[PDB]
Design a protein around this ligand. Structure first.
Ligand SMILES: NC(=O)c1ccc[n+]([C@@H]2O[C@H](COP(=O)([O-])OP(=O)(O)OC[C@H]3O[C@@H](n4cnc5c(N)ncnc54)[C@H](OP(=O)(O)O)[C@@H]3O)[C@@H](O)[C@H]2O)c1
Ligand SMILES: COc1cccc(-c2nc(N)nc(N)c2OCCCOc2ccccc2CCC(=O)O)c1
Length: 163
């Protein structure tokens, strides 16, 4: 079963300048805990954004989507489409699409769950930003309480499931 997991600002930004334009350790820990032991599917640009001690993401089957047939991605499985990523030779009980914006758009129609972190950070979008997908009426969700990070940002977790 396919789920998406992402963190966004309220304005809908998920990425900027090849990374994520805020710091939120509670959300990184949330991501690690939900995905550990499972398959994580990502676009090539998100693979390229992973810091060194996280490339590959440890304890998870990393699957990278690219059109570059000869791509070198040590510690990851390279595939040529999202549909390939979602058709493993070796099934996983849980597969998480972990970004980026390009892959979320392709995966959202194939998914039954989205785990969304909302970050109250003032981030008016900039021209090159990666932006969150939008959930339409086929999705319904529940929201956690607004929390404050030890780092100071307000945030909260939403869980959406396909109707
Ligand atoms: N906040 C969050 O939750 C979160 C999560 C993940 C990433 N991010 C951020 O988001 C940004 C990256 O996202 P992005 O949207 O720029 O890139 P992306 O979706 O991670 O990667 C795009 C790449 O995927 C490949 N691709 C796309 N469509 C394809 C298709 N139909 N078939 C085959 N390959 C395909 C292409 O790779 P090739 O060019 O190699 O062909 C393309 O360049 C970064 O800023 C990262 O930090 C944020
Ligand atoms: C600054 O915000 C961050 C930092 C790290 C991960 C995330 C994140 N969060 C949610 N909810 N879904 C996601 N899809 C997501 O990206 C996952 C891909 C990016 O992973 C990063 C990025 C920087 C640093 C570390 C990691 C992975 C850490 C790990 O698990 O071992 C957000």
């Amino acid at each position: 079963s396919v789920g998406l997991i992402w963190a966004q600002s309220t304005s809908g930004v998920i990425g900027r300048d090849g990374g994520i334009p805020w710091r939120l350790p509670e959300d990184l820990a949330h991501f690690k805990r939900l995905t550990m032991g499972h398959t994580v599917v990502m676009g090539r640009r998100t693979w390229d954004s992973l810091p060194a001690a996280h490339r590959p993401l440890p304890g998870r089957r990393n699957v990278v989507v690219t059109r570059q047939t000869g791509l070198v991605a040590h510690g990851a499985q390279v595939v040529g489409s999202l549909e390939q990523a979602l058709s493993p030779a070796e099934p996983d009980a849980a597969t998480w699409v972990i970004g980026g914006a390009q892959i979320y758009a392709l995966a959202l129609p194939l998914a039954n769950r989205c785990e969304v972190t909302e970050v109250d950070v003032d981030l008016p979008p900039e021209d090159e930003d990666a932006l969150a997908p939008v959930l339409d009426q086929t999705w319904a969700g529940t929201s956690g309480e607004w929390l404050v990070s030890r780092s100071g940002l307000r945030y909260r977790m939403h869980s959406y499931r396909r109707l």
